Ligand SMILES: COC1=C(OC)C(=O)C(C/C=C(/C)CC/C=C(\C)CC/C=C(\C)CC/C=C(\C)CC/C=C(/C)CC/C=C(\C)CC/C=C(\C)CC/C=C(/C)CC/C=C(\C)CCC=C(C)C)=C(C)C1=O
Ligand SMILES: COC1=C(OC)C(=O)C(C/C=C(\C)CC/C=C(/C)CC/C=C(\C)CC/C=C(\C)CC/C=C(/C)CC/C=C(\C)CC/C=C(/C)CC/C=C(\C)CC/C=C(\C)CCC=C(C)C)=C(C)C1=O
Ligand SMILES: COC1=C(OC)C(=O)C(C/C=C(\C)CC/C=C(/C)CC/C=C(\C)CC/C=C(\C)CC/C=C(\C)CC/C=C(\C)CC/C=C(\C)CC/C=C(\C)CC/C=C(\C)CCC=C(C)C)=C(C)C1=O
Ligand SMILES: CCCCCCCCCCCCCCCCC[C@@H](O)O[C@H](CO[C@H](O)CCCCCCCCCCCCCCC)COP(=O)(O)OCC[N+](C)(C)C
């Protein structure tokens with residue numbers, strides 16, 4: 001229960017809605033990058049060795 | 063009526079409420095919440111299930127009937143002719 | 144090649160013969176053969192054992208599915 | 217200075233219609249399918265609009281253009297499947313919309329209930345003509361059968377079927393003509409949807425109990441905007457699951473083959489949302505009689521308010537009426553299942569029994585049981 | 596005649612809710628198409644591109660598309676010359692018109708394969724069992740010499756002759772040319788030809804599932820937060836008495 005952490009977040013970035021919107025924009029930018037990278041890694045893991053990315057090395061520059 | 067202020071006549075009614083920020087969003091969701099859902103399910107259980115149970119019986123019976131209708135009959139050329 | 148049949152063996156044949164020693168896969172075998180013999184004798188019948196074949200094949204292919212691909216690639 | 221939303225002309229309508237109209241506090245999730253329908257309508261327009269930017273309504277290039285959209289056009293496949301699957305979701309919401317009214321007695325609002333019937337008929341027309349646009353094997357023959365079934369009209373039928381065709385067969389002129397109707401009709405539906413709300417607004421929405429809720433009305437915005445937003449999220453969940461995992465389960469294959477005029481497929485069937493009617497006409501032995509049955513049916517929905525004879529609006533406190541309602545729902549399920557099966561002795565008799573049972577339930581059984589229930593309570 | 600024989604549900608590598616196609620199998624399946632299929636089956640809606648990012652490299656695609664001549668437009672005089680072939684070209688038509696196709700196929704018209712998988716019931720399960728199953732006709736049933744008895748064919752009398760057998764072709768990968776192996780590979784290739792968006796579709800689905808799992812609890816919590824004012828309010832009735 002990081003009550004102090006939530007208190008700091010509110011007092012600095014939520015009391016005014018202008019700051020509230022700005023945090024949202026930066027958060028989504030970072031979130032999409034992390035979400036996309038993690039999801040693609042999971043997809044590649046489940047399908048290891050079948051995607052063309054995993055076999056192109058056997059023909060590219062070859 | 064059709065607008066707030068002139069809809070109906072009421073007297074001697076008192077209401078109490080609390081701010082959203084001062085109370086939990088999921089209070090007694092297992093002590094009290096789950097029991098209530100179960101109560102609702104049983105209260106309206108035998109008024110619905112029998113009709114759909116019947117539907118399944120006709121569905122299965124009709125499907126199996128059609129299959130038998132397309133199965134070779136021993137009477138077919140039973141006279142060896 | 145060293146062999147034109149041994150090298151070209153298809154895992155289908157092995158699984159096929161192997162899974163034809165099961166009560167269901169063999170019981171229907173005679174019910175088919177019996178049907179076959181009936182038409183061979185009867186000279187005017189217009190009957191065939193196609194419906195009898197669709198049960199033997201149904202049973203055989205059901206078992207073949209769960210074992211065939213393990214011996215591929 | 218008072219709020220501007222109560223003075224600006226455009227803001228008065230928005231405030232009345234969305235922000236502040238009183239609503240019952242106890243309306244359940246069943247009252248959430250009306251807003252979804254419009255949302256689906258909105259979704260069906262935009263997607264279709266983009267598809268219209270690439271589709272070619274001609275007997276020869278129609279099939280080719282669909283293949284081009286699915287493969288070469290960027291994100292064409294997803295747009296097509298959203299359009300196709302959104303149609304089915306629209307009808308599912310539509311049936312649930314109608315079902316709620318029958319159970320909770322909303323039909324008592326005659327003016328609003330009658331407008332609804334028109335919206336349903338228009339919706340079906342839009343969906344039927346849209347299914348011809350792909351110009352597949354099933355589309356060609358589906359239109360052929362559902363159109364040749366106007367030759368039974370006493371004396372004008374034959375004259376009014378060739379006129380619809382634009383010729384002595386179904387060819388490109390039919391395709392282009394249906395394309396224009398498909399485009400235009402949904403916008404008329406949108407306008408009619410505003411008459412539906414308008415006539416509703418002068419009386420107010422109903423509640424599950426069936427008692428007037430003037431004592432406990434609530435402003436629509438905060439509570440129900442978030443509630444309808446939650447419903448929209450769930451609706452999107454269902455739609456995306458259908459499209460992104462199993463797009464073609466609800467469609468019928470053999471529609472992916474070029475339409476062959478001289479090749480009748482062994483098993484012609486309408487779409488899942490139209491099957492219930494197909495079995496009601498295939499059962500009647502007379503061709504004209506089957507058309508009269510398919511029509512007399514849809515219209516019994518208009519007659520429901522007359523046949524109502526109970527002294528309670530809501531069927532919540534009417535246990536016997538509930539049993540009949542679920543029985544009738546099961547009957548519709550049987551009709552749907554029969555619609556998808558070939559003609560044969562068992563299905564035919566089952567369909568015949570279901571049809572008569574469907575009608576007699578609505579006409580005799582429901583009024584009689586309501587009268588008995590009234591007698592029981594000593595009204 | 597009788598009810599159609601339903602093919603069984605074979606376990607495919609891509610049948611999983613999140614599984615993807617095996618692209619090496621697609622490459623081998625295409626290699627089969629070039630020799631055995633191309634003779635009398637058409638693929639109208641597939642170009643020599645669409646393979647660059649799937650199995651073959653761009654340079655390999657160029658080398659292969661140039662292997663077959665294609666018709667071009669008019670010349671100075673107006674005559675039509677033949678180009679070596681480019682990426683944007685589609686796969687050559689075995690026959691000009693349906694009449695010639697049927698005339699050379701004993702009346703039967705081989706359908707285009709671009710959507711055969713999503714057209715026939717049972718998917719590739721139907722195709723695989725169709726190619727593997729050519730049984731000797733049962734007793735008491737006869738058919739035209741041109742026709743062939745295949746139980747999975749709805750007429751049980753198919754004009755197409757057995758298309759595949761052991762050692763019809765040698766794959767570059769070096770895998771054995773087993774008839775079962777060939778059938779599986781071509782079925783994978785046909786599945787792709789009918790649903791090229793397969794892999795991307797499932798990737799989007801995975802992202803949607805995780806996003807939905809995150810979102811739905813939050814939106815429900817917000818709704819509970821707003822409605823808590825009513826879900827806990829208490830009433831009283833104090834008449835003047
Ligand atoms: C198995 O194959 C089959 C299918 O699958 C494949 C199918 O899909 C279908 C289904 C058919 C599908 C497409 C084809 C059918 C198409 C049609 C019937 C309709 C034909 C028309 C269309 C394209 C055009 C649609 C028309 C449009 C837009 C015109 C309407 C335009 C407007 C603005 C609307 C305006 C209306 C206004 C002002 C009137 C206002 C008032 C009202 C509603 C109030 C009601 C008034 C009244 C009298 C009624 C009240 C009555 C009272 C009390 C009496 C009670 C009534 C009783 C009856 C008892 C079939 C048949 C089938 O075979
Ligand atoms: C439960 O409680 C509730 C109620 O009860 C209290 C309610 O009552 C309601 C309200 C009921 C509902 C929604 C239900 C339905 C009811 C309604 C009133 C609404 C009815 C709906 C409609 C009419 C449909 C509305 C619209 C839809 C889909 C949009 C279609 C129309 C459009 C404009 C949309 C936009 C399309 C766009 C932009 C195209 C996309 C392309 C874009 C970038 C490229 C565009 C490019 C161009 C134009 C380029 C042009 C270039 C030109 C000239 C060249 C110029 C060149 C130069 C050099 C100058 C709810 C929700 C509720 O919950
Ligand atoms: C000067 O002072 C004034 C003012 O200020 C003081 C004012 O303010 C005003 C205020 C008023 C105005 C200016 C007036 C105008 C105001 C406006 C906003 C302008 C609005 C304009 C409009 C909406 C446009 C109106 C026209 C529209 C959309 C088009 C109308 C026509 C149609 C949709 C088509 C109708 C049908 C036609 C041609 C018939 C042909 C087709 C068919 C039969 C259909 C064929 C079949 C099918 C679809 C098939 C359906 C069935 C099918 C498949 C199967 C059925 C089942 C089987 C079994 C077969 C005025 C007058 C004034 O003076
Ligand atoms: C285009 C198609 C869109 C389709 C959308 C479909 C959506 C489906 C799902 C529906 C979800 C419904 C809920 C979504 C919002 C939930 C939270 C919301 O309801 O809360 C409100 C949301 O309100 C807003 O947050 C208010 C601030 C506005 C923020 C705007 C952010 C915009 C970001 C994107 C900008 C893009 C710019 C692009 C330029 C080119 C009020 O929050 P509240 O806690 O009571 O505000 C207190 C203010 N404080 C903090 C200052 C005290």
Ligand code: HEC
Pocket residue numbers: 631632633635636700703704705706711715722748749752753754755756757758781
């Ligand atoms: C020229 C001989 C020939 C060969 C070899 C051939 N096709 Fe065909 N194909 C035909 C003909 C002819 C038909 C239609 C026969 C009929 O309908 O009786 C047909 C039909 C089909 C069908 C339709 C099955 C159905 O249920 O509609 C499929 C699928 C098919 N072929 C796939 C293939 C595949 C995979 C190969 C592997 C190269 C192949 N064909 C090779 C000529 C051939």
Ligand code: HEM
Pocket residue numbers: 246247248249250251253254310313314317322323325328329331332333335336339409412416420421422423
């Ligand atoms: C086809 C598009 C339709 C749309 C967009 C639509 C929209 C709506 C909306 C938003 C409501 C209020 C909110 C709600 O009830 O959920 C409503 C109520 C109603 N609708 Fe519809 N509707 C449509 C079709 C129909 C149909 C086909 C009927 C057939 C009976 C119908 C009958 C009713 C009735 C009787 C009400 C009153 C509900 C009440 O009083 O509680 N509507 N409609």
Ligand code: HEM
Pocket residue numbers: 257260261262263264265267268271282296299300303306342343346347348349350398399402
């Ligand atoms: C409620 C509104 C609508 C409904 C219910 C509806 C329904 C349908 C249906 C069921 C199909 C068949 C698609 C298929 O089987 O693949 C279709 C096709 C189509 N519709 Fe819509 N439609 C609506 C609105 C629109 C609009 C507004 C447009 C254009 C402005 C449009 C354009 C198209 C096009 C281009 C196709 C061809 C897509 C294809 O062949 O796959 N539709 N429609």
